Protein: Tankyrase-2
Organism: Homo sapiens
Amino acid sequence: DKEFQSVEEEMQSTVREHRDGGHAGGIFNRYNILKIQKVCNKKLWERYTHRRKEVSEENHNHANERMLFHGSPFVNAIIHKGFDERHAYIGGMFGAGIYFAENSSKSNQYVYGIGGGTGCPVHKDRSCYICHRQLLFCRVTLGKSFLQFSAMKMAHSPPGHHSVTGRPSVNGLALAEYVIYRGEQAYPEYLITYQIMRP
Ligand SMILES: Cc1nc2c(O)cccc2c(=O)[nH]1
Ligand SMILES: [Zn+2]
């Protein structure tokens, strides 16, 4: 399939050399994609498209839809129940929102928890090349996105906006990140099962 080839391409081409030297996500340059499953949750799709239309009508008929990565130990809970802002932490860089990356390697750092947690459950390795990892390639409605460089502890989107775009800066972020404050503003379209590969 050319659809799954595009997802595989997006996943491999957006890998970057991280500042922590592979402490959180692991030491790799490439992945071994094992499976790409299309998520068909009609209840989550109706929630997404209805909010997408709302945002579109509030942003000059433009949803500002982007395909972004999301890493989390609760990926299986998200494909069934959806994204939930009620579980979001106020302590986050851009506050109590749901965070997404345009770089697959950035989202990979969150697959086993914040900062890679303790790593894989069986070997307790953040750089495990054996254990199968799971990422989400989500359809995210950004709408009128608020451009921010430094920390901004938000509870909701800034007034008149629908999301926060974290842009890279010298003292701040190394890579971009996108924050929504409503669970229905994202749809977990693809479930990617993969492994990080030894360089
Ligand atoms: C839990 C989580 N956090 C992220 C982040 O803070 C920034 C960018 C991406 C992510 C992500 O994919 N998952
Ligand atoms: Zn392992």
In short: The chain has one domain: 1-199. Residues 1-199 form a domain with the Phosphoenolpyruvate Carboxykinase; domain 3 fold (CATH 3.90.228.10). The chain has four helices and eight strands. The CA atoms of residues 168 and 180 lie 18 Å apart.
